[PDB]
Write a protein that binds this ligand. Structure first.
Ligand SMILES: *[C@@H]1O[C@H](CO)[C@@H](O[C@@H]2O[C@H](CO)[C@@H](O[C@@H]3O[C@H](CO)[C@@H](O)[C@H](O[C@H]4O[C@H](CO)[C@@H](O)[C@H](O)[C@@H]4O)[C@@H]3O)[C@H](O)[C@H]2NC(C)=O)[C@H](O)[C@H]1NC(C)=O
Ligand SMILES: *[C@@H]1O[C@H](CO)[C@@H](O[C@@H]2O[C@H](CO)[C@@H](O)[C@H](O)[C@H]2NC(C)=O)[C@H](O)[C@H]1NC(C)=O
Ligand SMILES: *[C@@H]1O[C@H](CO)[C@@H](O)[C@H](O)[C@H]1NC(C)=O
Lengths: 42, 47
């Protein structure tokens, strides 16, 4: 995934919006959740 | 919070400080004025 902060490797990109869990930069944050990949796979 | 569509504020007029929908950046007239006034350097974009 390409982001204004740089290149993000290993994180699935969703198009929802939640509270900033792990701030990355330029308005992008990362979090650990089920988020499909299914309903329980994290 | 979001301002109502109808700006019936008893004669007071907040057009110049409320957001301007037209601009791609939803910034007010005065905010745009300030942003243009400051000549920022070393933005830190992707480059
Ligand atoms: C709240 O205050 C703001 C102050 O800007 C007001 O917005 C506009 O202010 C100007 C000046 O007071 C109004 O008159 C304009 O004057 C300039 C020359 O100084 C003219 O070029 C303008 O003519 C055209 O352009 C305007 C903007 O595109 C149009 O609104 C206008 O109909 C003409 O087509 C104009 O005569 C101006 O009317 C206002 N309005 C706007 C949209 O700019 C604002 O109106 C005030 N809030 C309310 C509810 O009135
Ligand atoms: C490397 O970063 C640059 C931007 O700084 C980009 O490179 C170009 O991106 C545009 C398309 O968006 C096109 O010009 C080319 O696909 C890319 N290479 C060149 C010479 O222009 C891009 O973000 C990154 N490079 C690539 C191949 O994606
Ligand atoms: C996310 O945004 C919209 C759906 O809301 C869609 O067009 C886009 O393809 C989605 N991108 C991804 C990676 O799911």
């Amino acid at each position: 995934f390409q982001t204004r902060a740089g290149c993000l490797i290993g994180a699935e990109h969703v198009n929802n919006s939640y509270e900033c869990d792990i701030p990355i930069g330029a308005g992008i944050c990362a979090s650990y959740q089920t988020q499909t990949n299914s309903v329980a796979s994290q | 919070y979001k301002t109502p569509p109808i700006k019936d504020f008893g004669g007071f007029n907040f057009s110049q400080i409320l957001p301007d929908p037209s601009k791609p950046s939803k910034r007010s007239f005065i905010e745009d004025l300030l942003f243009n006034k400051v000549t920022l350097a070393d933005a830190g974009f992707i480059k």
